[PDB]
Design a binder for this molecule. Sequence first.
Ligand SMILES: Cc1cnc(Nc2cc(F)c(C3CCN(C)CC3)c(F)c2)nc1Nc1ccc(F)c(NS(=O)(=O)C(C)(C)C)c1
Length: 289
Amino acid sequence: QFEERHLKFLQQLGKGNFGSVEMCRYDPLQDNTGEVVAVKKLQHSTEEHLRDFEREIEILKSLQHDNIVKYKGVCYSAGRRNLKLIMEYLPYGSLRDYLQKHKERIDHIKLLQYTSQICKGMEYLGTKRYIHRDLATRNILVENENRVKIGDFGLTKVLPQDKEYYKVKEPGESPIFWYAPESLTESKFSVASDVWSFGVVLYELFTYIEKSKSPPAEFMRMIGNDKQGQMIVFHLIELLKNNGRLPRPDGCPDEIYMIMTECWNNNVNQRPSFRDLALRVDQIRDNMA
Ligand SMILES: Cc1cnc(Nc2cc(F)c(C3CCN(C)CC3)c(F)c2)nc1Nc1ccc(F)c(NS(=O)(=O)C(C)(C)C)c1
């Protein structure tokens, strides 16, 4: 589909784990008429990561939604190595950086517009029995001032056809400050744990990515910055077990923070669905307008 001899590297957009995303121009005619695309590749083409990356490509290719980053194709060299994922390029970057830049022009109604778009994108994943796991403002991309998209699926897993959860323990850094408690203790990931993580995403939006108010900062100040390594996740477990939650962001209405706290239910079954979340957000957004 996309030949590597026509992918012109422009700049690197982001580097997480275990791959990176590059801004490239696919210009096969060699006349600056091609489009700028986003190319995701691996940093170490191991067989374990290559198998996960191929399943990630199939997941994204199976997704067609206004709030999901569009899949365009793949690219590979001689063989199955150097495999790359070709996606659409969204100009305004991640919602984490975009909100932090225009924080003086993005009111609460605009935050609820992005919130509904995230819920409708997550609910579409739930119909496919996909568990995103890694939902955060760093993963939500901005196409323009009126549309955001879920921009990465490197941790997304398909649920077993007979279970509603998915147990997985991946070696490496885990965003434990977005994870549901059952994901920290039992490595259990479900649609309900995505609801917990969405509540953290809702917390991020209303903090406007103030670095002192970040979920890791607030959680670490609650358990004490003196905690060390494994004792960090253990005190976070004990804190969440005792209804220790992130504070209400500055200027956040009471009803918006309730959505966060209700998503932050220790009882996995008592967390609301994304369709109910979209309803309550659209209901508040209409009452504001
Ligand atoms: C699939 C995709 C499509 N379009 C874009 N557009 C975009 C991304 C930018 F960053 C930026 C800038 C770059 C410079 N600085 C200052 C920030 C803003 C920009 F102008 C446009 N980006 C994508 N991917 C992507 C990229 C970079 C990440 F950091 C992440 N984050 S990530 O998913 O968690 C992962 C890397 C997988 C761990 C995803």
